[PDB]
Amino acid sequence: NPSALVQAMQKPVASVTDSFKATLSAKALRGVEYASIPTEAGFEPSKALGDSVSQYTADELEFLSDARSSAELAQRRSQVQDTRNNYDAMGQNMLTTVAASMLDVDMVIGGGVGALSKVSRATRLAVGLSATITPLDVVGTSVGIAMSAIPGIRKVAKAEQVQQGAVRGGVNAAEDAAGTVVPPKDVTVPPVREVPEVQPIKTVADEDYPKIDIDTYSNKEHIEVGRSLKTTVQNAVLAVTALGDDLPEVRALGRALGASRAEIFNTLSDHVRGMSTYEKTILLHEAAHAKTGRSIRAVESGAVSDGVVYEAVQRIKEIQWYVKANVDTHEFISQLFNSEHFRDALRSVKMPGSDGTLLSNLMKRVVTLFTGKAPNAFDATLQAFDPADVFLNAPKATPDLQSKVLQAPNVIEMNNKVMGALNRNFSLYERLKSFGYKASTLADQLVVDATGTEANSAAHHARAAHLASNVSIVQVDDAFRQALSADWPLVQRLRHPVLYREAQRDLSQKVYQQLAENHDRFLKGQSIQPSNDPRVNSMVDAFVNSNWAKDELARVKGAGINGADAVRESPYYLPRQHSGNKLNDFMRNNRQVTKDDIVGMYTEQFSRMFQQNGITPETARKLGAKMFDNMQDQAAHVQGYRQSIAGMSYDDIENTLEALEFDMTAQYTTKSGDMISPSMFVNNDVMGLMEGYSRRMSGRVGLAKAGFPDLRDAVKAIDEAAAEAQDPAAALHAFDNTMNQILGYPTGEDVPDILRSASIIGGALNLANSGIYQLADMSLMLQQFGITKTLKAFGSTAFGRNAMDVAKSAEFGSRLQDVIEARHVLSGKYRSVLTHLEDNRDIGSLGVAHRYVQQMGQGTRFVNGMEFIRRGQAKLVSGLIADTVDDAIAGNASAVTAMERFGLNQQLLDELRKATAANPDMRKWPDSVRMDIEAVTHNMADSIVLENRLGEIPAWMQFSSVGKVILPYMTFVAGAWNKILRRTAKLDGATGVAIALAYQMPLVTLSSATSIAISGKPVTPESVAQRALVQVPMMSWAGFAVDFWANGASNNLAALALVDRMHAAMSSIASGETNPESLIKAVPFLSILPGMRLMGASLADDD
Amino acid sequence: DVVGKRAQDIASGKVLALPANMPADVSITQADVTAGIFDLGLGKDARNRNMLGIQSWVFTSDADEKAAQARVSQVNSAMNNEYVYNQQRGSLPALVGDDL
């Protein structure tokens, strides 16, 4: 009874997750490697572990509770063990665990076993060790070490020398044998000479590796000697006295001081030996400034009330006060040293309260300070008070940086140059402001990421909104993968690449059709019913519970974005569009149907739709013809804004009327008697229809919150701003290109999405003293290493020659650059080839996939990585075809006689030459000859893929000079792959970050080399390495690592979540706080260096 | 008694999980061939009492050595594939080293 009152009046116990904050805490970034495992009905991770739950550290349990089936749990329990084994070795040295927080890719990108726990432990360790004298310096130095170890390279060896060395082993290692079998009484020499079976290999220290060191003394008082070796004052002084036999018997003063900062010499026992007697006395004279360390402690409450020193400080401050009336402590104390007549001034006065000159008693207390022995050594300092390269230096603003391109004379220029090399956006924001004043105001509303105010640009809000969508797109992506996990094991996918693609098109059609019924039934108050195919029910369920459909309709209504209330809502909603690809592909197989029929088809619909408004027949035909002209533009990716300003960009009738309801079942009849209907040309895929909608709606929502809820005034504000600069034409083009990028339209260039980079602008001073510049400088030197090794590798191989040489020639370098950059393929005439290759073949078509499926670990890290290479190779092939077609049209006979192998004839060529002459722009081919040259190219595209598999040059391609560089490429890369797997043999994260760079680095090198030559300057490795930085700054290199780790919707979460974690830390730093947590979080680009080491060094190894 | 104790020791999760890559100590080398592995016991033909199928057992040329060297690597690759397949499905037994 009474115990009821006690519990009735208590307060409820807190949750068991309110504690453990900063340890438990985003599941998508942790289950990428297990995505394609089917779910198990009624599985429960807690009920399956049973008694075993008592052997984990409260975060391993967090990582283990995500299992959805027995196999997933079995694999997670395996990964947790490798995670322990890796960190056991690194625990041998405390400092190395501090640098593990910034250099383990699994922990900084995603997929590791706990990330918060490691960071929250590294911060505590860094704080503890400092009790390299402040917590920031411990973080800074922990990475300077662990990266300065010069690597060793393999080299061929002579067999005899190695065998001699190995024979001196065994001997010198068998003298410890007891020899109780076959005693010495029974030994004899064998009648034949033996020889061991060692391999002929050496090891040699590398020569091009840089000598990396970190500066940690700029922001503190320090002593420079001979203006390297770094030591402390209390260490240097002792060495001077010991090796100081040539000093006046001053030596006792040195001994006394040695028992009482940072020092740098530009082997310690010999540095002091190479000094004259005079200098090494000035070294002690400046070391007598030890007072500063003690003046500070008596201003702060460190030396609370300790006698002697506390009284000496008070009676020095009293004298400091006295001199003002009758004739901070640091300046007075410094003047006592660094001047002559100042001392003479104090001699001509006696104290008002004791015997002795004012100067005499002042010195009495300095000895108490820099010695600490209470109140005879005054004679020594008196005589030490009577040009050398030793000085005492106050803190300076600009650190010492080793890289060439970062040095600047003042703090503003250095800050401007540092941020340029990290983020792409900064150099764009800078270039926008040169267009006068109106541009400057408008620039702040589009691209900047303000750190000190609420009003923030449109790109920031769009980035913030685009994460919410992807958190729900992923849950549906993982359901599609699981629906085909059975019936298609990895081995089968590699054999039948073409057919595998249809297994997805079938499910997409089924699910899309199923979601149409349940929407129309929901909207009319009827009842929903399930289907009889078990996959469709699961796919639909994963869609309703995803919940993004209502979220988007709620968000878009926020801020009232134009005519958005007209839309209707339901959990099964899905937009509607036509597809220009399905129209062309259908019109290719059938040639009885011509343009004359599609326009008539749409005319019938348009005439019936607007009957009540008295639509005259002429307008019906005009609208029918303008639904075809702007449908071809959709397939070729030549659209842009300024054509969808009336409303939103997802209605097919508004976009047709703005340019000056469909039955979808009514059947039309063509000339040949074939029947046709508009349903055949509707879009069907789901994911490609979800991402497109989400990306553009995020861009519209972000733009509204910046102050432009409707684009009509957004256009006007640009037209008015451009008419202020000296060249209005360029400014308008720049702003149009920026707006197209923000809204998510194809600009035709090959660049990463604008949302993936930040434009932080804020306090220059606070950033400099945080120490970020030193860490940015280090990561920028290692580029020299990789690029130098790549240039050497090109210089070595025969294929590297003539390939590094075509790039210099003005006759061909320009075309090779265009082929690498994919500038003729991404949009315009030729995109049909890229579309056909992109979504009609699988990883099994590479050929290289078969050759490595068993060395590489046969897991997800193989398939996830191979898509990146597919999407790399398709662009090269398409660019080669595009180049060799224009060359043929130009007049090169040797190309024409190879073009005709696939079906050209005089009739097509004459018309093509005629058409090209009238108009060289040609955003698209004319309707008269479209369907023939289009088929000619597609036939070629297929053939090359079959003959080129091995990495060989087909016989009929011997004419093309540029093709000699592209076709054999994949054999060159395979060489680097073999050497890396001969060094690690695992394919873990560090190996992936090396393979991706091994594939992607050389193309950048060739493009940059071509770019430098045409500008009439010499091409040296340093020049190439510096020019590469203005194409792919550091934060874009990490983009490739993410691209090789995850694919599709899961990529966006990781790529975006790194940037905000950087902005949120630099904002806090700029405000005035420098918590080491902030420094750790503020440099996510530093993760790829250890992976860089493996690739960079591996290119020097012998075969 | 040993079996009974081991069963309920396994049931309690006292055994560490194996890595994702097979341990180096599980591979087969010449020292294991000398130890007597691949011995098939009694048989009719000389070729049918060694699992590798080599005939010469008294005087052997280098051609037999090359075939043996290739076949050892073949068996190692087969074992690696089997181990990977078993590990991925989460069906590996509670054994280590020589037992595995």
mmCIF file of N, CA and C in Angstrom, chain A residues 51-52 55 71 74-75 77-78 81-82 84-85 854 857-859 985-986, chain B residues 11-21 77 81 84 87-90:
data_model
loop_
_atom_site.group_PDB
_atom_site.id
_atom_site.type_symbol
_atom_site.label_atom_id
_atom_site.label_comp_id
_atom_site.label_asym_id
_atom_site.label_seq_id
_atom_site.Cartn_x
_atom_site.Cartn_y
_atom_site.Cartn_z
ATOM 1 N N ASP A 51 21.115 -15.277 -26.124
ATOM 2 C CA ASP A 51 22.079 -15.030 -25.056
ATOM 3 C C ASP A 51 23.298 -14.267 -25.553
ATOM 4 N N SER A 52 23.511 -14.225 -26.867
ATOM 5 C CA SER A 52 24.741 -13.662 -27.407
ATOM 6 C C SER A 52 24.823 -12.149 -27.271
ATOM 7 N N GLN A 55 27.955 -9.592 -25.535
ATOM 8 C CA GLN A 55 29.342 -9.509 -25.979
ATOM 9 C C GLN A 55 29.516 -8.392 -26.998
ATOM 10 N N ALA A 71 20.635 -14.338 -43.272
ATOM 11 C CA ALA A 71 21.871 -14.119 -44.015
ATOM 12 C C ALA A 71 22.445 -12.733 -43.753
ATOM 13 N N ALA A 74 24.156 -12.799 -40.474
ATOM 14 C CA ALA A 74 25.409 -13.536 -40.558
ATOM 15 C C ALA A 74 26.507 -12.686 -41.183
ATOM 16 N N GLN A 75 26.163 -11.880 -42.188
ATOM 17 C CA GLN A 75 27.180 -11.049 -42.831
ATOM 18 C C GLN A 75 27.575 -9.863 -41.954
ATOM 19 N N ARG A 77 27.593 -9.813 -38.656
ATOM 20 C CA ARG A 77 28.472 -10.349 -37.625
ATOM 21 C C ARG A 77 29.874 -10.602 -38.152
ATOM 22 N N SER A 78 30.015 -10.890 -39.445
ATOM 23 C CA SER A 78 31.343 -11.044 -40.022
ATOM 24 C C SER A 78 32.048 -9.704 -40.157
ATOM 25 N N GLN A 81 33.743 -8.160 -37.126
ATOM 26 C CA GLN A 81 34.996 -8.753 -36.667
ATOM 27 C C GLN A 81 36.195 -8.147 -37.386
ATOM 28 N N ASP A 82 36.089 -7.967 -38.702
ATOM 29 C CA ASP A 82 37.138 -7.259 -39.421
ATOM 30 C C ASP A 82 37.308 -5.851 -38.883
ATOM 31 N N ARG A 84 37.048 -4.905 -35.810
ATOM 32 C CA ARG A 84 37.898 -4.995 -34.626
ATOM 33 C C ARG A 84 39.345 -5.270 -35.009
ATOM 34 N N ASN A 85 39.557 -6.217 -35.925
ATOM 35 C CA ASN A 85 40.922 -6.598 -36.277
ATOM 36 C C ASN A 85 41.696 -5.417 -36.842
ATOM 37 N N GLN A 854 36.512 -12.993 -60.089
ATOM 38 C CA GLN A 854 36.936 -13.869 -59.006
ATOM 39 C C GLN A 854 38.078 -13.310 -58.168
ATOM 40 N N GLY A 857 36.133 -9.313 -55.024
ATOM 41 C CA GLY A 857 35.470 -10.204 -54.091
ATOM 42 C C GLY A 857 34.076 -10.678 -54.446
ATOM 43 N N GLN A 858 33.676 -10.562 -55.711
ATOM 44 C CA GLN A 858 32.448 -11.205 -56.167
ATOM 45 C C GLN A 858 31.199 -10.658 -55.482
ATOM 46 N N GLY A 859 31.346 -9.628 -54.662
ATOM 47 C CA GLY A 859 30.259 -9.081 -53.874
ATOM 48 C C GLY A 859 29.615 -7.881 -54.531
ATOM 49 N N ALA A 985 45.127 -7.497 -52.566
ATOM 50 C CA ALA A 985 44.411 -8.757 -52.730
ATOM 51 C C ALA A 985 43.108 -8.828 -51.940
ATOM 52 N N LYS A 986 42.570 -7.683 -51.515
ATOM 53 C CA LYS A 986 41.335 -7.693 -50.731
ATOM 54 C C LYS A 986 40.187 -7.025 -51.475
ATOM 55 N N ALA B 11 25.954 -22.560 -28.544
ATOM 56 C CA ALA B 11 24.649 -21.923 -28.425
ATOM 57 C C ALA B 11 24.733 -20.591 -27.691
ATOM 58 N N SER B 12 25.755 -20.405 -26.859
ATOM 59 C CA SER B 12 25.895 -19.196 -26.059
ATOM 60 C C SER B 12 26.689 -18.101 -26.761
ATOM 61 N N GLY B 13 27.092 -18.311 -28.010
ATOM 62 C CA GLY B 13 27.823 -17.292 -28.739
ATOM 63 C C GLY B 13 29.224 -17.033 -28.234
ATOM 64 N N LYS B 14 29.941 -18.075 -27.820
ATOM 65 C CA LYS B 14 31.311 -17.935 -27.344
ATOM 66 C C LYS B 14 32.345 -18.050 -28.458
ATOM 67 N N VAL B 15 31.917 -18.191 -29.711
ATOM 68 C CA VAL B 15 32.814 -18.382 -30.846
ATOM 69 C C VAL B 15 32.804 -17.115 -31.690
ATOM 70 N N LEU B 16 33.993 -16.639 -32.053
ATOM 71 C CA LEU B 16 34.119 -15.431 -32.856
ATOM 72 C C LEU B 16 33.764 -15.715 -34.309
ATOM 73 N N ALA B 17 33.156 -14.727 -34.961
ATOM 74 C CA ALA B 17 32.789 -14.868 -36.363
ATOM 75 C C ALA B 17 34.026 -14.814 -37.251
ATOM 76 N N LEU B 18 33.961 -15.535 -38.371
ATOM 77 C CA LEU B 18 35.078 -15.580 -39.298
ATOM 78 C C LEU B 18 35.092 -14.334 -40.184
ATOM 79 N N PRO B 19 36.253 -13.963 -40.721
ATOM 80 C CA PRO B 19 36.321 -12.775 -41.581
ATOM 81 C C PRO B 19 35.627 -13.013 -42.914
ATOM 82 N N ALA B 20 35.523 -11.933 -43.693
ATOM 83 C CA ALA B 20 34.934 -12.028 -45.023
ATOM 84 C C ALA B 20 35.888 -12.648 -46.035
ATOM 85 N N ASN B 21 37.187 -12.660 -45.747
ATOM 86 C CA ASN B 21 38.189 -13.278 -46.604
ATOM 87 C C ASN B 21 38.792 -14.476 -45.884
ATOM 88 N N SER B 77 41.904 -22.421 -55.831
ATOM 89 C CA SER B 77 40.856 -21.548 -56.349
ATOM 90 C C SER B 77 39.474 -22.132 -56.078
ATOM 91 N N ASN B 81 36.539 -20.298 -53.836
ATOM 92 C CA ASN B 81 35.179 -20.051 -54.303
ATOM 93 C C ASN B 81 34.154 -20.688 -53.374
ATOM 94 N N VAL B 84 33.891 -18.609 -50.169
ATOM 95 C CA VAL B 84 33.181 -17.352 -50.384
ATOM 96 C C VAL B 84 31.682 -17.603 -50.482
ATOM 97 N N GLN B 87 30.261 -18.386 -47.070
ATOM 98 C CA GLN B 87 30.249 -17.236 -46.172
ATOM 99 C C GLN B 87 29.126 -16.271 -46.529
ATOM 100 N N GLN B 88 28.912 -16.031 -47.825
ATOM 101 C CA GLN B 88 27.882 -15.072 -48.217
ATOM 102 C C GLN B 88 26.499 -15.509 -47.752
ATOM 103 N N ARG B 89 26.183 -16.801 -47.859
ATOM 104 C CA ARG B 89 24.888 -17.299 -47.412
ATOM 105 C C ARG B 89 24.768 -17.352 -45.894
ATOM 106 N N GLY B 90 25.853 -17.115 -45.163
ATOM 107 C CA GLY B 90 25.812 -17.203 -43.714
ATOM 108 C C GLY B 90 25.582 -18.606 -43.194
#
